[PDB]
Amino acid sequence: DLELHPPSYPWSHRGLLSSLDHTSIRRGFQVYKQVCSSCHSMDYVAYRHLVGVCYTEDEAKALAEEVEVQDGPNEDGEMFMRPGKLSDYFPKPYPNPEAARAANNGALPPDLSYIVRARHGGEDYVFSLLTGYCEPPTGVSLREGLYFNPYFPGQAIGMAPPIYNEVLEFDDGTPATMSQVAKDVCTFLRWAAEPEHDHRKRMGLKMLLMMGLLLPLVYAMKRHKWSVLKSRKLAYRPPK
Amino acid sequence: HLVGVCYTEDEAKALAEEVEVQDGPNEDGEMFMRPGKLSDYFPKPYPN
């Protein structure tokens, strides 16, 4: 019943004009697909969103095609499966929340689309949750289905450690260590929650530059106009 | 909707109860059937 606030991990995309690491997103997606996809929903992303961010259109289409998803109704009046497409949203692991709580010890694995924006701390919290698994100290006797992680609010998380050294292998030939996985997937879950992130900071730069240009120019016009009054000199001259 | 128009509450409830309709999800995470009720809309003949 005590708080443990995460630290300030210096991300690639931390500063005011600092963009997302699209190769790290690329790997971070693979971490979702390979590891987090089997348990966790990501309802508000489709394979077309990946195009021009971390993958090409053809590459992203191939990944959609890999998985098979429902479509219909057909002419007979029934549903059938077909290979996925750019327009398909990412496959949900279970049909509903009750199937999740059935499958996972009465615990709902939450949707990872907005998880960074949904929790306090964001990537720092998600990273410290993933990498920060440790043993329960003397006194802390947890029950069935539970694991000790200190960064989680209740100290007793219902999630098995999801990532460990070389749980997957990256296509670009990067050393798949536990903290490298955590880094990449958190860099991806940022993008899932805030895809506007790069474009928004560019607008930011352009806004600061343009405000830097205009504010003195407008202030100069204000001063130029008000000058008449600000320099004026009042002389009282009554008669006798 | 039938109650107070053409039937009583008890009569209308019996007719709802005659037919069986879907409800859920349950705790296992799946759908099941149950006898109909006043709040159930009339069963659609086909799914689409």
Next chain:
Amino acid sequence: RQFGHLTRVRHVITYSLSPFEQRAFPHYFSKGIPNVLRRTRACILRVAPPFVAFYLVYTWGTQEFEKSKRKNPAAYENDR
């Protein structure tokens, strides 16, 4: 309420100058920074102490909240 019907003003003379004839920023850092400072000295005593008092109550209250959140030495100590 219009220019002409506002009020009775007598024996005043207003000397003005065209904005193109005069400067926009006349003695800005020269005369201004002292004037800004003077204005700051005038107000500070009236304005600041409540915000200081807020800061004291703020940090203290957060400090005392963190103290009360944490463990205490009477929790089952000298009591097996």
Next chain:
Amino acid sequence: EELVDPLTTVREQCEQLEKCVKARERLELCDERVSSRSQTEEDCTEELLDFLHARDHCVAHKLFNSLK
């Protein structure tokens, strides 16, 4: 071949620091307290969290230097 995570290097490097080992001292001192008592309703979470907070602050300072 077996692989190694910079995390485990940087964590042991950061565990060197005075405040880390001082929290670690109180954690160990708690562990023996809770162990030596007969039956209690008490734990050593606080001191683990003090330790981890002091450590992971330092971890974050130089962990990402190793990662890409």
Next chain:
Amino acid sequence: APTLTARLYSLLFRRTSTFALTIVVGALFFERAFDQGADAIYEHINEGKLWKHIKHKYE
């Protein structure tokens, strides 16, 4: 001698008719100039991290 800024006033923006033509054309050029510059600044700030830098890679 005709000065620097007076030479602009005299021929470019004395009339309000040409004043606007100057602004419009100046704004037309400014847009190309500024966007291009601030894009390049943002892209140099964020070197190698955007898609356009790693696009040749997978294409």
Next chain:
Amino acid sequence: AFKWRGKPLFVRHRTKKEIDQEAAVEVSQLRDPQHDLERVKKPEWVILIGVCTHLGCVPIANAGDFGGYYCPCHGSHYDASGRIRKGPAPLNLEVPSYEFTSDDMVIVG
């Protein structure tokens, strides 16, 4: 837990040992003084509106100190009959109006 009138409806079948446990709890000790019997219509089946009486906050069952539930917001602990034990909450959990149609079906409201 059920979505009833938008509110959580906590129907609770209590184990034979747990039923007379709450009967074994003494009546003048509670902030809002009530015996278990004056809250329940069938000893095994107690039902409650799952809303903390301090401020609207959904409790969690099989949690807290006693056998009933707990409130996350400011730590109000309840017992298996729904009665308030630990503060800062003022009153016992609100029992709805209900009756049993047959041995298997129950109706609330």
Next chain:
Amino acid sequence: HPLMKIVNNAFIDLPAPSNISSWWNFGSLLGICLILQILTGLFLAMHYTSDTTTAFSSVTHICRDVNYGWIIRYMHANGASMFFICLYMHVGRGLYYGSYTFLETWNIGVILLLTVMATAFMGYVLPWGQMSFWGATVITNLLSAIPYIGTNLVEWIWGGFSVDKATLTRFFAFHFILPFIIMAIAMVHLLFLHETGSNNPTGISSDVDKIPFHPYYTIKDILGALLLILALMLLVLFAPDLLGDPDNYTPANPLNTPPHIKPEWYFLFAYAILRSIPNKLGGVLALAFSILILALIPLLHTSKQRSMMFRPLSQCLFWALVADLLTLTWIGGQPVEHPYITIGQLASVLYFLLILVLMPTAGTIENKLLKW
């Protein structure tokens, strides 16, 4: 020509005072905020849907898929806050400089505040996140504390026995329209102001020294508009989730209450005054009176000087009232535990004591010092 003459006497050659500080710029900014909320809001409603099935999906659809939908959303969401910052400046200015002596202008003001509070509250429900749902469920239920009809009043408001799809859809209808009632009220706010003229920082009749609104205050209000835009776009582009709560990105769920439950930042002072009193009805009446006491301010005025410019005791107590509000805003944000309960209790009493007891006495003493 009948319209231009209205716009002349309004904005072109309206005689303004010569010595008006930047504290009078907030009026024009509040209109710019109102127009910004209207224009952004309209474009959000073009894609937003008010059904509990689709409400969340629609807001995320805007951010993700509607071209530049995100920038419109956060301009609405942070502009809402900028509107409120501007309001609290605009209200305080009048408290300081004695502008409440334009009774009708001020009392229309007091209405304008309340309508925006209702607008923004109902607006916050719309996206249908946890904090939006649970904010409504908490704040609305307060009315059940009313003596004899509150429990009915609440169910009528909701359209059922809880916050639900009935409530959300009407809350959208009320949001989309009440801004226009606000703009209508605001034109009457201005209408009484031209009757009475405008105030200046000295609190001394500036008929002797007037200047035409244009070109002076036109270019000044333009300058101020850029500073408001800057402040908005800093929030929108660098810190869009700063003032907002994270829990509202978790879709709403009536079977699971978030632990740290609260309104948005602009109601936290009033939320803290409500929490101060333990009795429910008392908490509601104090919550109400915290806002509505603004209407008693012109009756509580005592000093023979109008403005606080020449009034030390009043200035200190005014700046105390600001700090005390910032204390209450802080306390409202924190949970209801020690020591925040006692700080909130004292802060809440201090709030009403400054307004009702002290600042009038200060003015009365200030008179006696100057032989009044």
